[PDB]
Structures are given as C-alpha cells and as structure tokens.
Amino acid sequence: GPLGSKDKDGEGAPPAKRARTDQMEVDSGPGKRPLRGGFTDKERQDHRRRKALENKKKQLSAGGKNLSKEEEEELRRLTEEDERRERRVAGPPVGGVNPLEGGSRGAPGGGFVPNLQGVPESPFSRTGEGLDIRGNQGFP
User: Fold this and answer.
1) Where is the composition biased (Basic and acidic residues) (predicted)?
2) Which of 108, 104, 55, 47 has the alpha carbon at shortest distance from 79?
3) Please, which residues have CB within 8 angstroms of residue 22's CB and are 6 or more apart in sequence?
4) CA 68 to CA 71: how far, in whole Å?
5) Are residues 67 and 53 in contact, defined by beta-carbon separation less than 8 angstroms?
C-alpha cells in the first residue's frame, strides 16, 4: 500500500463539519392572562348598553321611531347610578345645623306690661319732648 502519501503533503480527507443542532417550536402553549382591572363586566355592559341606546336615540329619533320601555329604562338607571357613582358615590350630611335634642327654645319676655321697665318710673319727670297734643293738622 501507500508508504509515501500522508495528508500533510496535500490536505487530506475532509471529515464531518459538525457543530450544528436542530430545534423545533411548540408555537401554541400557555401564555399571559389579562390583568384588566377597574370594575367587573357589569360596568362594561353598563357603558356598552348606554352607548347602544345613545345610538338608538340618534337613529330612532332621526327616523321618527322610538325606544322600547325595556332598554330606555335600563339605560336611565345605568346613567343615574353612573353619575352618582362618579360625582361622589356616597351620601354627605348635606350641611346640618344641630341635632335638636335638649336645646328647647321659646319666647323670652313676660308678655305685655303697663311699664317700660329699666330707667323709667324712677325719674320724677317724664321722657319725651316737652309737650304734645295732636298737632296743627290734628292727624296726619
């Protein structure tokens, strides 16, 4: 056989190239769950409903039509509750004055008396002007 060939004199035999791998992708699998907050689906239906009707208000009235008792009522309530919720969602005391329990009142005085009290009826003379009868006209 060959005694004077080698591979250094030329190049030799080209081996495997190697250093390679194959992969596959599952594609569909577990993912992310939503974290939508705010309120429940209820409030969302609230807005959908509302604007569904607001649309109806537009189209129906423009076509000489009218809303049905059903959806007209539900919406009104949706709106009523919505606006109170937005505005305060609570009940303030309004602006009270005083819990009237034991603060009983009345009319301080003594009725009618034949005296002015105080300083009067001490002087020997009388308070007024000096003299008076009727006047030059008798009665204005």
Assistant:
1) 39-57, 74-89
2) 47
3) none
4) 6
5) yes
Radius of gyration of the chain from its Cα atoms, rounded to whole angstroms: 51
Range of the domain at 53: 41-87
Residue 19 lies in a domain: no
CA distances from 140 to 97, 135, 136 (A): 48, 9, 9
CB 49 within 8 A of CB 78: yes
Are 60 and 67 in contact, with CB atoms under 8 Å apart?
yes
* 122 in any annotated domain: no
Distances 52 to 31, 46, 73, 115 between C-alpha atoms, Å: 33, 10, 13, 79
Interatomic CA distance for residues 15 and 7, integer angstroms:
13
Q: Is residue 73 part of a domain?
A: yes
